[PDB]
A paper describes a structure:
In archaea, the 20S is composed of homo-heptameric α- and β-rings, and PAN (Proteasomal Activator Nucleotidase), a homohexamer proteasomal ATPase, is the RP found in many species. Unfolded substrates enter the chamber through a narrow pore in the center of α-rings, where N-termini of α-subunits form a gate to impede unregulated access to the proteolytic chamber. We designed and assembled in vitro various asymmetric archaea 20S, in which one of the two α-rings contains a point mutation, K66A, which prevents RP binding to the α-ring. Our studies reveal that, upon binding of a RP with a conserved C-terminal HbYX motif to one α-ring, the gate of the opposite α-ring opens allosterically, resulting in similar proteolytic activities of 20S singly capped and doubly capped with PAN.
[name] is a heptameric 11S activator from [name]. To test whether the HbYX motif is a required element for inducing allosteric communication between the two distant α-rings, we further determined the structure of the asymmetric CP αWTββαK66A in complex with a single [name], which does not have an HbYX motif grafted to its C-terminus. As expected, the gate in the proximal α-ring is open and there is no rotation of the α-subunit, but the activation loop of [name] is engaged with the reverse turn loop of CP. In contrast to the results using PAN and PA26PANc, in an asymmetric proteasome bearing [name], the gate of the distal α-ring is closed. This result suggests that binding a proteasomal activator without a C-terminal HbYX motif to one α-ring opens the proximal gate only, but does not induce allosteric opening of the distal gate. Indeed, the peptidase activity of symmetric CP doubly capped by [name] is about twice that of the singly capped asymmetric CP, as predicted from the structures and the stated hypothesis. However, when bound with [name], which does not have a C-terminal HbYX motif, peptidase activity of doubly capped proteasomes is greater than for those with a single cap.
Residue numbers in the entry:
A (entry chain A), B (entry chain B), C (entry chain C), D (entry chain D), E (entry chain E): 7 to 233
F (entry chain 1), G (entry chain Z), H (entry chain 2), I (entry chain Y): 1 to 203
The structure:
Amino acid sequence: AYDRAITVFSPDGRLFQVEYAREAVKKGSTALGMKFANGVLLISDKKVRSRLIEQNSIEKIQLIDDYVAAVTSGLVADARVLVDFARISAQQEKVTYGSLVNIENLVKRVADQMQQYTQYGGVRPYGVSLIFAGIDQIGPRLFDCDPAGTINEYKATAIGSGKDAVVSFLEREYKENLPEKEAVTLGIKALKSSLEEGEELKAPEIASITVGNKYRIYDQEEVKKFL
Amino acid sequence: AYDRAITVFSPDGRLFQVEYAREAVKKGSTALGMKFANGVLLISDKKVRSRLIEQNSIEKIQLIDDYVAAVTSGLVADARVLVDFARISAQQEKVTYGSLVNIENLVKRVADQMQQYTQYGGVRPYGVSLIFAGIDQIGPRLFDCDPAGTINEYKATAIGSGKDAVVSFLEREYKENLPEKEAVTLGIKALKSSLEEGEELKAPEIASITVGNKYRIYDQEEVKKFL
Amino acid sequence: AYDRAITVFSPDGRLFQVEYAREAVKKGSTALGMKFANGVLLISDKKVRSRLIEQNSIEKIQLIDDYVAAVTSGLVADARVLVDFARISAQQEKVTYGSLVNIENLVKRVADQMQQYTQYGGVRPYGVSLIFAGIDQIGPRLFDCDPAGTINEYKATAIGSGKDAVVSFLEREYKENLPEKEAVTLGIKALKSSLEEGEELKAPEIASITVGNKYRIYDQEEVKKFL
Amino acid sequence: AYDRAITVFSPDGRLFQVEYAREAVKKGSTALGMKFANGVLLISDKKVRSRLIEQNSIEKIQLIDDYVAAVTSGLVADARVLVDFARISAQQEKVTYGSLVNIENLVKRVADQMQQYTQYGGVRPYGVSLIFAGIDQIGPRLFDCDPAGTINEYKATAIGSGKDAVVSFLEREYKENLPEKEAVTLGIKALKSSLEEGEELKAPEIASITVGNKYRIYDQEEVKKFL
Amino acid sequence: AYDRAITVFSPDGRLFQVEYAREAVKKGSTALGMKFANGVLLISDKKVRSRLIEQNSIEKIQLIDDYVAAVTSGLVADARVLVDFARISAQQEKVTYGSLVNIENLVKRVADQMQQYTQYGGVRPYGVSLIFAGIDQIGPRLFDCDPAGTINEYKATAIGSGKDAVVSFLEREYKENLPEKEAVTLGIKALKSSLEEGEELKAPEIASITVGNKYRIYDQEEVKKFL
Amino acid sequence: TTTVGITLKDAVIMATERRVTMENFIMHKNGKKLFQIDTYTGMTIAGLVGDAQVLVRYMKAELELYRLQRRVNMPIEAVATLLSNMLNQVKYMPYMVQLLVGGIDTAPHVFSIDAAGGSVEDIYASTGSGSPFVYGVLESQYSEKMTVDEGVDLVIRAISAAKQRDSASGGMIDVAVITRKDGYVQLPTDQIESRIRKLGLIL
Amino acid sequence: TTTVGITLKDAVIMATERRVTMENFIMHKNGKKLFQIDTYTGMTIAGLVGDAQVLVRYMKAELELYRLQRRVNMPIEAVATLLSNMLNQVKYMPYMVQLLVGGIDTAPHVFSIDAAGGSVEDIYASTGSGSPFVYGVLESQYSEKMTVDEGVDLVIRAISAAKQRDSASGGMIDVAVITRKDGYVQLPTDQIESRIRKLGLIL
Amino acid sequence: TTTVGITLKDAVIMATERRVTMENFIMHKNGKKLFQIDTYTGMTIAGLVGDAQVLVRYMKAELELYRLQRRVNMPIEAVATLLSNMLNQVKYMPYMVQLLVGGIDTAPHVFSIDAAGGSVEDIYASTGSGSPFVYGVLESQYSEKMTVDEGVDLVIRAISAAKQRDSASGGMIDVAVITRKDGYVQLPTDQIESRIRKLGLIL
Amino acid sequence: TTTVGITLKDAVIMATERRVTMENFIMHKNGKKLFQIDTYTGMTIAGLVGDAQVLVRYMKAELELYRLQRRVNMPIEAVATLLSNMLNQVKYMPYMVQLLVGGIDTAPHVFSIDAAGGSVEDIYASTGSGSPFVYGVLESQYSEKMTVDEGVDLVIRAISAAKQRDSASGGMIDVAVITRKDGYVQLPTDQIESRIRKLGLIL
């Protein structure tokens, strides 16, 4: 009915095509991000499909530069095209202005790219949500972006399948300005609260930055210390 | 039937697609605007989705410059694209003419952008209404704009879910040339008359300007003084 | 059937889509225009939706310049886009030729713009009729233009909901070369003959021009003198 | 079936969309044209919709230049767009060649414009037939052109509702090289033979041209002399 | 099913839309062409719709230059557009090369124009077959071209309604290198063998050329000598 | 070349020489530089020949299309504004021409247009190579209280002075008087020779 | 050519000469260089004629469209900014003109715009060939405590000095005073001749 | 090079030399500069060779397409107007050529077209390097009361004078007479040598 | 023209002259060359007037749009990088201007940009015609241990030296001090005249 085209509103004024693209997000792995004292971090689960897969390859935390990073969930091909568009947009802003002063417009350019395909006929939306985390001249920023293009800045969030659970636990447990070790411990406990027990958390990716420093990926052993 | 394309009139000459886009406006938060003595104000409710949301972030009152401001209701992604188009259009008029002398043509450029997508196939309308408020060289102006593109200048209005309530209370209670404190008190009472009792008004946003001054956002405590 | 596309003739050779756009015209307010001795006038009813509406704002008589004016009926967003296209076209003719010698080609450019969208797929027609009135070097001209693009020059006409009734009253009562006061009195009586009795005529707009003069809007008190 | 698109042949190889556009011609007023001794004439009936219409306005005989004239039947908005295209095309040929040597290629350019829209998707045909009449360096020419684009040169013809009747009477009564008064008398009798008796012919338009002269519109009294 | 679009093959790999455009050809008048001793001729029947039609006008044999000629059958508006495209293409080849050395590439350019519209969506094919006849530097050439674009060079052929009958009689009676009078007599007998007896052949058009000469239309009396 | 246009009481007289060169080398002893551009207005040519004939074709076409679409003639201010916009839309591939368009609508006018499209009114004007001579004699003898006959005599005396004192002008003078009553009427060459032999300018 | 514009207490006076050349060869003894551009502001012309008349047509059109869309007049800063952006969007196929636009909105203004589009305010300005002379006399005699009559007398004395000491200027001076009360009023030629004969500048 | 075209009573005679250079260095002692452009009209060439042959190909094509679409020949005013619009649509990558097109429709004509596209009628015309010589002899000997034989004798005397007194012209003269009765007929070289030996111009 | 910008301890002082010429012929005794470009940074102009005013309009627009979209001011390195990319995207239809943008974000800065878009920092800079004079006095007297009052006295002494020893500069000096505490404050002309009369530079 009001259902099989991006350019058709419902009688209640809804785009079911966009909300179906939002349903595509819920099939991805759970990732989270949170602000802490002078910094911000990202944590991400991974499907380990087999033992023949490379570990040290396609990773759910992607750097956008040395001062913006991002995690994705949804269709992985769309997500890779999005992260590469975000990287090109960041480098264009660096050519034009010498530096990236607000992450929010990098998020806005990515989200306007995503909104543009919820409107014109002959394209489909992007079935991906993203979380951006980084330092700019305002401070630590943390965003999410969704198939509609809606931008939200948060203290902490998730995306993916266990998102609701990870939100609800943070809806009981998150505090501002934690030290970094405590913030990661809270994040790992949050990610464990989304699993269905019996099932156990294999080694997740964690990135983080503090103000005045550059980027920092935990290697797997530093992650093992918190499991 | 006459129903699933923007380019098809009904046998009564209606575009149901546009009115369905107007039904998207009714799902947003209630905002209002009103003129007072030498000035104009905007008040807006907010959905506070969770406690993990940032307060000091994406806000329902948006500045278009230092001498035009706006509130939106409807699809938030479309609304953000609209506010950014309005900002770029205002800055283009400032490059061309040195100043913004009438807000009405900024509203007209935004509304022609909205009307253009109620006509051409392969695009959908914008499911957003806007209220513009500001000072120009004519005086205090206050507008609304809708998914059809229809422009109206008012003394006072609302948009959003509780619009029909907030208009009706103003249809009993609005007077011209109130002092600013009385006008804001009338607006807060108007916004409370749209709630379903038991449910109480959390902290809303209020902006306002008087002639010869610049912009002025109330912080939260100055808002608390009227609750 | 032959029904849901602008580019499809019926087996009798009709475009039902265009005639549905003509049915859109009948939902607007009634306006009329008539020629009198060395001049021409326009009269227009208005929906006053509430008491919170601005009176001194969006008006049904619009100036196209100092020597062409126009009233509209139908979709108001389409009608505003049309009046602005007419203004830009009049100013283009003034840049090219120094003056506007025949109003008829301004009407022809607007009507060709309207006819162009009764033909190409992917656009809808304009659901608006217009009446143009003014002085040119031929004399007083008075036109109407419709969603098909059909141009007709008249002694007197109406557009809108009560159109037929008004036309029928002029079909009994109109005479050429009346003085301006008698012509406006005939027009007000014509507009009253389209109402359903009990319902009474609130303050309408009236504009008029005589040869060798410029434009002239009656203010509300001068209109009250004829009610 | 084979029915609702211009770009689809029937199993017999017919375009029903084109013939439906030809059915639009039959709802127009009857006009005729005929050759006589060193000249050619056009006669046209008119719908007089009301007494409030201007007589001295939109006329069924239109001049294409001081040596080509034309009458139309069908969709009147399309017909006016066609007559204006024919005028622009004649003036382009006069720019290029200094004069119009053959009317036939003016007719061919109009007919190719009409044929181009019986082929490409997303446009509809032109629901108008035209008769061209004039003097060129070959002699008096007389044509018709139809929604398909088919050109025919004749001694005498009609278009419109009574076309068949006006053809059939000429199929008994037309002779070459009549003097002009006899030819117009034959044409008025032909136009009267298409009416349904009781209904009487009000004042029609007649134009005529002879070799070495420009056009000559009969005024209404010179027409009254033949009624 | 596999039926209502030009771009859709059948499960047997047929284009029914093209073959329907070929069924359009069978509703036209019968024309034939044949080679004879150092020359080639064309003969064509005509519908004489009424006695009011001009004889000396739109003719079924059309010259493409002084050294290529053609006859058509099918949609007459399409056929006229085709003959004019063939004339422009012949003149382009004469600009480029100084002369027309092979008629076959003129036929190829026309047939590629016809093939191009049996492939792209949004256009229909040309419902016309053509026969080209002339002298080039190879000798006398004689072709047909169909809505599919298929080119065939022949000794003798027909197109139109009676085509099969005219082919079958030539399938019994045609010899090479006849003198011209005998070849025309054979063609007239062939054209009479396609009629349904009782119905008699009114005056047809015949053109012909011999090597080293130019073009030569029979007038009507020279045709009457063979009836 | 030389042109002349005079506005007087209810008429406007425009006349040219007829000698076209196109080289140094006078080549055509009978050209055409006075064009009727519409049933009540005419145009004179004083520039490069080909560009100006293209201009005359375009203005005939546009004014005829105008009269057809509006059932009234174009005003003289409108045709000069149109001609100025045409010449000024392209001035870096420019037309090297000096146009002079005269005519009557409700009052007589003669407007001058340079190569850059500066339309300007004057009660008498002249363009071309032998133009300052006719400006001299029209400065010395012209009065606005003239009739049509005194006007056309003044015009023939002017162009005769320009033919006597300039190389580029010459040939048989042709004159057209445009008035509201009789419309646009170009004088036959017999009356022109009659006025030349009467005024004592023949040699 | 010469133009002059003076801002005084609540008024602005703009006047020009009327002599257009278009050659060396002064050709039109009565041109038009003072244009009303809107009901409370005017514009003066001191450059190439055709380009400047195109500019006047465009600015009349844009300001009339503005007043129609907004139901209020355009400010003077806005019209000079618009005119500067117009001249500076194309400067490599440039307009060779010196524009001077004056008018009153809530305070009188007269702005000068060069060929490159440098809008700049001044309390009195002048453009054209005979411009340094009127800058001399306006440097020596102008006071901002003048009335309208002393102002228009100063303006006529200025343009009379420029007509006396310059070849390119000349012809009959035309003056228009634009004030907020009576609007834009152009003085008739009888009052201008009266002030010329009164001030002892007639010869 | 040299061309000549003469309109007389009911005929038009056009003749050229045949010597093409293409360098200083005369290179082709037998070229072709006289082209039949349609069954009743012809065209002569006096410019750059390649551009002019492109022009001849285009005009043959356009006039043949015209005769096919309209079943009648093109008038001479129409072909000169067409040729002028063609040369004047591109004049900044211009054709350096001087065209001369003659022919008969209901009255004989010969029109001259310069490189800028200035079409102009004359009763006799000539183009090319050795053109002023044939203008001299056609100014001295031509009368419009001639027959066809006196006309073609005048033409051969003209081109013989141009061959005697000019370097760029030369070679065997070719002449074509176009009349309404017999159409376009180009004289064979035997009759041309006969007229050369008869008129006492052979050396 | 002359500009000057000085970075000292927690402030930046930028001042210009006000005399615009636009000809040789100094024309405007009170221009405007010191522009506030954002609530904590300003820009000075030392080139062609029209191009530079277009630059000021564009930079006001872009920085206001920036502050609106990001709720924070733009850094000075970012605005100079933006301005350099703007001037260097078009340098073959170039802007002939010398820009100097100063301001404070967390530390004061004043950056110089040439016509080719070479942004470079310096603790004091100057542009314009009378620029080497103020570079001389700022080389001789400037110390980075100054206050705001000693700084603005140094600036007025500098521009007074440039007004004394240069033709292109002149007019009334205008100065604006931008600091983080009080923001961007332009000194009124009364305090400027007070410092001129105090420092013994008035004549």
